Design a protein around this ligand. Structure first.
Ligand SMILES: NC(=O)c1ccc[n+]([C@@H]2O[C@H](COP(=O)([O-])OP(=O)(O)OC[C@H]3O[C@@H](n4cnc5c(N)ncnc54)[C@H](OP(=O)(O)O)[C@@H]3O)[C@@H](O)[C@H]2O)c1
Ligand SMILES: NC(=O)c1ccc[n+]([C@@H]2O[C@H](COP(=O)([O-])OP(=O)(O)OC[C@H]3O[C@@H](n4cnc5c(N)ncnc54)[C@H](OP(=O)(O)O)[C@@H]3O)[C@@H](O)[C@H]2O)c1
Ligand SMILES: NC(=O)c1ccc[n+]([C@@H]2O[C@H](COP(=O)([O-])OP(=O)(O)OC[C@H]3O[C@@H](n4cnc5c(N)ncnc54)[C@H](OP(=O)(O)O)[C@@H]3O)[C@@H](O)[C@H]2O)c1
Ligand SMILES: NC(=O)c1ccc[n+]([C@@H]2O[C@H](COP(=O)([O-])OP(=O)(O)OC[C@H]3O[C@@H](n4cnc5c(N)ncnc54)[C@H](OP(=O)(O)O)[C@@H]3O)[C@@H](O)[C@H]2O)c1
Ligand SMILES: Cc1cc(O)c2c(c1)CC(=O)C1=C2C(=O)c2cccc(O)c2C1=O
Ligand SMILES: Cc1cc(O)c2c(c1)CC(=O)C1=C2C(=O)c2cccc(O)c2C1=O
Ligand SMILES: Cc1cc(O)c2c(c1)CC(=O)C1=C2C(=O)c2cccc(O)c2C1=O
Ligand SMILES: Cc1cc(O)c2c(c1)CC(=O)C1=C2C(=O)c2cccc(O)c2C1=O
Lengths: 256, 252, 252, 256
């Protein structure tokens, strides 16, 4: 059985869609009718469960494996993407791109090594750029690019400086590419979540779930669905006049 | 629609962007109060248009920027909402009504400045203040700003000032209203065809079209679609935010 | 000093930050007009203090936010400048005078709102407008804002709104005045000891000290030093800018 | 003969101080009395001429060679810096750090290679981070860190996206380090020049000196001295209440 919505007929790639925010994004886009390529690095069982969840709810989805931040990453990602799309649609067209996959590594600024710096930049900033560069060859007019940033680009947090740097680089993609792609009517935007419960063990550290909840003006951490809802909107026809924007989905974390 | 059971006030809803907002909120299930100053026939067209497509709407007259304005507005609003729903509850507030008066800054009189500030900043503040007594948890406040708070134009400086004051409402009330889960946000359209004869003059249309990265002026619906999303459950985690709905006008 | 041969108006110069600004501009060589509302004895102390250290200064009385305010100000200013220099040329304008009135937003009256807007936004706009007729090329306009335009505080919302309007002056007039090489900029102090008895209450001082990343409230001189730089030749390539002089208050 | 000013007794490092903006920064800081370490990669003759110019005007300066963006770069930079400082002052203390050195490589977004990306990031963002990390061990309280960004982080320019990304990363240093260093009273700020005539050949392309001049509200490109004057201010006692700030020295380029 197939369910129809505002994205029926469209195709989407959500990077790191096996858990947390990316999972909720994929589910929401699939629910809306988009054929969703559910990307992962090593969590294939989690990805399959997301893809199945979409398919069971009457949507369409498949999984693609790609380790990002290593040589040949984009090549591997697009080989699997295009194959799955061509198989299911008879074409390689990609309408919606969500750059969600990312890494974090807390620590004192004095302990950051060049290797740690390289990894952060490689996964959070370089890969999103080259994924965008590659998607342009297969993205039709009226397409969508959404990059998942962080409110940590607007709040000083010494233990997260490397991560903030990476996301501040990522935010520059929306600015410069929105102008580049204007005549093709492809919108490029950044969405900045605040603290969001991704399920991970480090959110179940009892000295962490506190203070994080105090960041938001609402006094809670976000559910991933709250962020997914914003991304789904940006991917839609209703967000056609928004491009090159920084979209604050932090639940009032950026209030100073 | 996702706004079934909700109520909404859209100020300046008789024409232009406010009309599109009211029409889009009605379609989604909200009982819309269509506000106007002197466009009585126009407001009634919008209210009828909402009812026609299966929704519920009514009109409320209030000239803003003069003493007792908010009193008049909320007298008409609460009376109409109670007659229709049995409560004075206001879920959604859109501060859309506004004036513009372009001209050299050397020529701005104090009275022009008072008028600009009275309608674009003061009234929205006192409208928000009065709405707090009737707005349930999970409510929505949306203030229509302008890209001109980020793009320098000497001819529009007092307009800019008024909208910069308006934008402060979202910042400060978001913190105030956090524990009631009422979101407060600013929306900034770019150049938008409001139906006025101005946007039909080919040479004015061409200059304005060039401001957006798309090479077009916006249709009102494009702005309404953004406001409709902010009013919804889907934007529960967006508060105190500046939302750029300018179609790439603010790219420098 | 680097301001020798220059003239300067500092509004609200009888006390606090404006006093420090006037004292620092005088020391650098500017003929300073020390403006006040009712602090006549205080203004005279500042003017004397400038002359004592080898500079030139005088006082100008004007209650702002009431009709004819700018007329009174510029009558006194241009008369005093002409008597002292032989011209009415005004090189440096600092819009520093301001009021604050903290309190719950539910309790803001329209008259409180008018007062706030009249003194903090309207007067600075009409002061800039009148200054344009007497300001030579290479001139300077500096508007004292506040970190509260970037930090949400319900108790300060109308203050915030007024300062958000003020900040629009720099954006739009910078473009207007580009070909005259007159720079227009906003400066935002953080919590600053203005000499008032408020900053002596230990528990108020402690709370305010915590806002800065330095754990201290600012001395007025720290703000004046920033304004002094903007007024100088060294800041010729800074226009239309928001200058954060808050000591790390705006770090989120 | 020695000239005295507001920075007498202080020491400064200006990266890429052999030409353009860095040269003007060094001259201005030296003129103010700071002992200036004039850094360069391959332009040793230009650096010596800057260091001599400062010394002739009654200041103190020496040159340090270091290629940034390659392994061991920071090690090499600090070996030469500390040696020169210890020789001249008897201590390794560094009061003022200016991260000025940087690269640019225009081009269509579709032509950017990973190697081009790596180089941009390595020189403009990574090296500034590790230079800051290393300077902290030798920077006394009341110190200064100034990073030279660009107005290109606020103006969309498709041909410069990689460069914008690098500078957007660089701007995150000021935000996170200002909070980290608050109790040590070290200020960390970003300064964003607009178009500035650095002398380079690419500024003498006649199809380039046009349009660039139109960026500023003043209708000219900046002289390097105009930017240096802003940096000198930030390095001074008068800028003690400014930290974590983005300082717009673009001559009204950011007006939209
Ligand atoms: N959580 C927050 O509070 C929060 C706040 C603001 C912003 N964000 C951002 O939101 C995005 C997702 O956050 P999250 O908390 O949901 O993350 P998450 O739970 O840790 O999951 C990260 C996702 O990225 C994938 N991934 C990680 N490294 C990868 C790599 N090298 N190559 C390919 N895929 C990789 C993971 O795949 P596998 O299953 O194979 O490991 C997973 O699907 C990130 O960009 C994060 O920066 C999160
Ligand atoms: N159009 C654009 O390009 C554009 C761009 C950016 C932002 N905006 C902003 O978006 C909002 C609407 O713009 P627009 O072009 O659609 O409006 P436009 O047609 O003037 O429509 C104005 C609406 O506001 C009402 N109004 C005006 N003054 C009023 C007053 N003093 N008291 C009560 N109502 C008053 C008018 O009522 P009546 O019909 O009774 O006179 C009308 O409904 C404004 O805030 C404007 O600043 C517009
Ligand atoms: N202090 C802070 O923590 C702080 C922080 C951020 C921003 N600011 C801003 O910096 C500026 C000065 O602050 P402050 O604390 O130093 O001032 P504070 O002592 O009140 O001093 C006010 C000054 O402005 C004058 N003034 C007030 N109302 C006036 C009016 N209606 N017409 C003409 N003059 C009037 C006063 O004149 P008289 O002596 O004649 O009454 C006095 O000279 C203000 O714009 C304020 O918003 C202050
Ligand atoms: N020019 C503009 O309009 C403009 C506008 C905004 C921002 N900026 C920024 O201002 C800063 C300086 O600009 P500029 O135009 O003066 O640059 P410039 O004339 O090209 O000189 C660059 C300086 O950086 C050094 N350098 C380059 N690569 C290096 C490396 N890999 N390792 C160590 N040093 C290296 C050069 O040393 P050598 O002499 O040995 O080659 C030189 O001293 C840059 O960060 C640039 O991004 C410039
Ligand atoms: C273990 C851990 C440490 C953190 O420092 C954060 C988180 C986890 C969640 C997260 O990624 C974030 C923050 C965060 O403060 C923080 C502070 C201010 C804004 C914001 O978005 C964040 C944020 O997203
Ligand atoms: C007659 C007239 C003059 C204007 O100056 C505008 C308009 C009409 C339409 C309008 O309201 C706007 C602009 C506008 O430039 C302009 C410039 C930059 C941003 C922006 O939103 C606008 C804008 O919304
Ligand atoms: C009684 C009183 C209440 C205040 O709320 C402030 C002050 C006094 C001093 C003051 O003017 C300021 C603040 C302030 O928080 C505050 C919060 C965040 C930024 C900021 O600049 C300020 C600020 O300048
Ligand atoms: C060859 C060349 C191309 C450029 O694109 C720029 C420059 C040289 C000088 C430069 O680095 C800059 C810009 C620039 O537009 C530009 C546009 C808007 C702001 C800004 O700072 C710049 C800018 O600094």
């Amino acid at each position: 059985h197939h369910r129809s919505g505002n994205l029926t007929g469209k195709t989407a790639l959500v990077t790191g869609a096996s858990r947390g925010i990316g999972r909720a994004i994929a589910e929401k886009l699939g629910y809306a009718g988009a054929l969703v390529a559910v990307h992962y690095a090593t969590g294939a069982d989690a990805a399959a469960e997301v893809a199945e969840s979409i398919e069971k709810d009457g949507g369409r989805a498949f999984t693609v494996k790609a380790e990002l931040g290593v040589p040949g990453d984009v090549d591997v990602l697009f080989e699997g993407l295009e194959r799955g799309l061509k198989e299911r649609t008879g074409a390689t067209d990609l309408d919606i791109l969500v750059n969600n996959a990312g890494v974090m590594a807390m620590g004192a600024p004095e302990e950051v090594t060049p290797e740690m710096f390289d990894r952060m930049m490689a996964v959070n900033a370089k890969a999103p750029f080259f994924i965008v560069q590659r998607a342009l060859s297969v993205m039709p007019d009226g397409g969508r690019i959404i990059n998942v940033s962080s409110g940590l680009t607007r709040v000083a947090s010494p233990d997260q400086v490397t991560y903030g740097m990476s996301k501040g680089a990522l935010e520059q993609i929306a600015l410069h590419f929105s102008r580049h792609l204007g005549s093709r009517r492809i919108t490029v935007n950044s969405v900045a979540p605040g603290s969001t419960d991704n399920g991970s063990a480090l959110f179940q550290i009892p000295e962490v779930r506190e203070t994080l909840s105090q960041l938001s003006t609402f006094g809670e951490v976000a559910e991933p669905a709250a962020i997914a809802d914003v991304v789904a909107f940006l991917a839609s026809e209703d967000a056609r006049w928004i491009t090159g924007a920084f979209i604050d989905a932090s639940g009032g974390t950026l209030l100073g």
